């Protein structure tokens, strides 16, 4: 069902949460080799989350579930903000700009915390 597909997508998103926090610790510790690997792992997780979210949105549309479509459109827009911040963080790491990396890291944490009440709303709506 689309609901169980959303629970699967929620789990992939929580995997990114866990990997992100491990990455933040490694950054603070200066373990750049670890950070590089965690950033690659996070890119794969976000690409997978984004794809599962698009399939869920498309399915809600085909089902005529107007409220779920509305919430998923709002949620998928915010996801793209996070993706942009994340990609900027990756570039800051490539460039050796720890000041920009720190900034984007906190921004991605706040963008993610803000989008959580809506994430829970979609679970109820599908
Ligand atoms: O795909 C997701 O839901 C997330 C990726 C990341 S990276 C930091 C917080 C999050 S939440």
Phi, psi of 19 (to 5 degrees): -65, -35
Other beta carbons within 10 angstroms of residue 85's beta carbon come to 20
Looking from the CA of residue 86, the nearest atom of ligand 1 is 7
Q: Which has the closest alpha carbon to 112: 75, 57, 67, 73?
A: 75
Q: Which of 108, 110, 115, 123 to mutate to test the pocket of ligand 1 (most atoms within 8 A of CB)?
A: 108
Q: Which residues contact 101 (CB under 8 A, 6 or more apart)?
A: 27, 89, 92, 93
Q: Which has the closest alpha carbon to 93: 45, 32, 50, 46?
A: 32
Name the DSSP class of 126: -
- Elucidation technique: X-ray
Q: How far is the CA of 20 from the centre of ligand 1 (A)?
A: 7
What resolution in angstroms does the PDB record give?
1.5
Calpha distance 15→41 (Å, rounded): 10
Calpha distance 53→113 (Å, rounded): 18
Residue 96 burial (CB < 10 Å; 0-12/13-18/19+)?
Answer: exposed
């Amino acid at each position: 069902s689309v609901k169980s597909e959303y629970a699967e997508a929620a789990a992939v998103g929580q995997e990114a949460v866990a990997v992100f926090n491990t990455m933040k610790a490694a950054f603070q510790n200066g373990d750049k080799e670890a950070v590089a690997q965690y950033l690659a792992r996070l890119a794969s997780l976000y690409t997978r989350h984004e794809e599962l979210l698009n399939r869920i949105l498309e399915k809600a549309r085909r089902e005529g579930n107007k409220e779920a479509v509305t919430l998923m459109n709002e949620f998928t827009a915010t996801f793209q903000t996070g993706k942009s911040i994340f990609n900027a963080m990756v570039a800051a790491f490539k460039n050796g700009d720890d000041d920009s990396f720190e900034s984007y890291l906190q921004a991605l944490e706040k963008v993610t915390a803000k989008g959580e009440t809506l994430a829970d709303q979609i679970a109820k709506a599908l």
